[PDB]
């Protein structure tokens, strides 16, 4: 299919802005915010047929999701929320919506130049996380 070719690979976090405020808006507690905010994760994206896998590896937590676009799944997030997730491709952007406890957050992953830019939005608060090839 080649749907996500330009996302595939191993990516390393190189910059972050407003992530603590995003985590506050999500409801993450103090200690997790502090430890999670230090992490410099590897994001590893691969595709096999229709199944996309995204791994996040860091000193804080190692997470993994596998999914088919448009098909809801269960996710336990790094901060231990139990959420219902749906990921779609919209105009070349991977759009990941998480629902839990009547709340919602959206994580967008986009290729921009040689970077993979991750925008995390909770209500009025956005955090931008910039990844480069590992
Ligand atoms: C670590 C974490 C917590 Cl604790 C809460 C909520 C989000 C994260 N992380 C992330 C989740 C999705 C995409 C990127 C990141 C990132 O760390 O860049």
Distance 129 CA to ligand 1 centre (A): 9
* DSSP helix, strand, coil percent of the chain (3-state; round to 5): 15, 55, 30
State the method: X-ray
Judged on CB neighbours under 10 Å (0-12, 13-18, 19+), 61 is middle
3-state SS class at 3: coil
Cα–Cα distance for residue pair 71/77, rounded to 1 Å: 18
Rounded CA separation 27/15 (Å):
22
45 within ligand 1 shell (Cβ under 6 A): no
DSSP string, 53-88: EEEEE-SS-EEEEEE-TT--EEEE-TT--EEEEEEE
**In the CATH scheme, what is the homologous superfamily, with its name and number, of domain 5-130?**
Calycin beta-barrel core domain (2.40.128.20)
SS3 state of residue 37: helix
Resolution (A): 1.0
Indicate the annotated binding residues for a fatty acid: 129-131
* Span from the CA of 50 to the centroid of ligand 1 (angstroms): 24
Dist. CA 79 → ligand 1 center (Å): 8
Domain boundaries, the chain: 5-130
């Amino acid at each position: 299919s080649h749907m996500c070719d330009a996302f595939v690979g191993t990516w390393k976090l190189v910059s972050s802005e407003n992530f603590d405020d995003y985590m506050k808006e999500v409801g993450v507690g103090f200690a997790t915010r502090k430890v999670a905010g230090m992490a410099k994760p590897n994001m590893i994206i691969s595709v096999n047929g229709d199944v996309i896998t995204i791994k996040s590896e860091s000193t804080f937590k190692n997470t993994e999701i596998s999914f088919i676009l448009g098909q809801e799944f269960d996710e336990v997030t790094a901060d231990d929320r139990k959420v219902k997730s749906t990921i779609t491709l919209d105009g070349g952007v991977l759009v990941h919506v998480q629902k839990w406890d009547g709340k919602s957050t959206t994580i967008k992953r986009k290729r921009e130049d040689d970077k993979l830019v991750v925008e995390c939005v909770m209500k009025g608060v956005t955090s931008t996380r910039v990844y480069e090839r590992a």
